[PDB]
Amino acid sequence: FTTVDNTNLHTQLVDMSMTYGQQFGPTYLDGADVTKIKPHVNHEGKTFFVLPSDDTLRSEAFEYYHTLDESFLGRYMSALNHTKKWKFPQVGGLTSIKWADNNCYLSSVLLALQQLEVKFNAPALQEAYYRARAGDAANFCALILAYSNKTVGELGDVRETMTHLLQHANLESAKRVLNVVCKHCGQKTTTLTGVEAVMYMGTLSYDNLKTGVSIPCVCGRDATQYLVQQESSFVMMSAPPAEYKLQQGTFLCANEYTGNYQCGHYTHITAKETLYRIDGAHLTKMSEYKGPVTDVFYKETSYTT
């Protein structure tokens, strides 16, 4: 029994002589890489993981994971070896992660997804996510790491991570139209789809984007950008961390980042009855917040001006 998706098993008969690596190529088993080891006296009838050695495992790996990256399953396994050892407490109603291995940023990603009307197209993601929502999150965390080419123990950036993951999200009907202006110039309409329809870097305030947001121009004096139309279930506003005040009823959730670029700490802020700050296993409550915020999520259905 080999498998690359844990859904389709492929019965195989083993030889005393060689190691799995010999007969199967790169191999695994319950995380325990068993590539260069031989058959047992007990656990035959075992399901093994394997590299798409052949046209059919390749095809099943792709349909499940929606990736052609030959290194993916290996990196995924390695991460799973650590994440399956993580704790995943329910905090303010949501699955979150006990701090370990600089998993901060994954903790914020996971808490924020649980609040967005979002679906994944890769079956591995859809499934792993459903289980994470029920508090079984190791696979899902290890998939996040693998899909964004990070390893356990690195600190990571939440915005970059969402970038990789939302590429695998159902954005197929998301649309964003922005008007651009230059009062020593004319007026340019732009339409954005996929990830950039929901993800904006340059201000934390969705209103600001509605009423116009500025930056140094390309002809003499500054140019403006404003939102003429939005279609999606949410939007994510990001900016380098800056002192910013979050009020109840104004936003859905947010991330704070304290530190510098190289090293620092994320916590997650969500507004229910009141504002909550989730710091892995830890929860605190507050009526209002002013701190270094870097991502703010807003709820949406259809906006037009």
Ligand SMILES: C[C@H](c1cccc2ccccc12)N1CCC(C(=O)NCc2ccc(F)cc2)CC1
């Ligand atoms: C939110 C924050 C951020 C985003 C954009 C601009 C920023 C400017 C200053 C400080 C943080 C900024 N992020 C910056 C990168 C952080 C990170 O992954 N650090 C690990 C690392 C370690 C060594 C490096 F040389 C560079 C990065 C994770 C979060």
Ligand SMILES: [Zn+2]
């Ligand atoms: Zn101009």
